[PDB]
């Protein structure tokens, strides 16, 4: 309702979303290197 | 306490167990010393 706390801040949840996508990006880079069917990565 | 010696050349099947310690270093062979000797006692020289 109108008496609810708005909390004044949407920047924290946006920064957490930017970190989760950045963390899932590199996690999905090495997803195909797991198990006997994994593949090598030459850097 | 485990040792792994890196070396170029050979095949994967050539890897085998060695009952004793192996030295990564090689002999000098400047004055033409022996390369093979049986029933030898190994002494560790810690000085110059």
């Amino acid at each position: 309702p109108s008496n609810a706390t708005f909390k004044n801040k949407e920047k924290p949840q946006e920064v957490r979303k930017a970190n989760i996508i950045a963390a899932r990006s590199v996690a999905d880079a090495i997803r195909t290197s797991l198990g006997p069917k994994g593949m090598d990565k030459m850097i | 306490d485990i040792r792994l010696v890196k070396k170029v050349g050979g095949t994967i099947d050539d890897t085998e167990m060695i009952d004793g310690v192996v030295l990564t270093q090689t002999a000098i062979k400047s004055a033409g010393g022996p390369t093979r000797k049986e029933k030898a006692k190994i002494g560790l020289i810690q000085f110059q």
Partner: protein
């Protein structure tokens, strides 16, 4: 070569085929024993193994990552 491998053990002529093949000078099939073409057995041993490990090293690569020099 196939007609040699399939053959009965007891067939001299066919077995011999197992022994010969391509000639690059005259362009016909002649015997290697009389021609003198011969190699060591060690040359083929550990050659396919090196080519096998060479194939394994590139074939297992999925993605490529490059870091620029500092």
């Amino acid at each position: 070569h196939a007609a040699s491998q399939m053959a009965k053990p007891e067939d001299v002529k066919r077995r011999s085929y197992r022994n010969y093949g391509l000639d690059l000078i005259r362009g016909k099939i002649v015997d290697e024993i009389h021609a003198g073409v011969l190699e060591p057995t060690i040359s083929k041993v550990k050659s396919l193994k090196s080519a096998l490990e060479a194939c394994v090293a590139i074939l297992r690569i999925d993605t490529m990552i490059t870091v620029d020099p500092e």
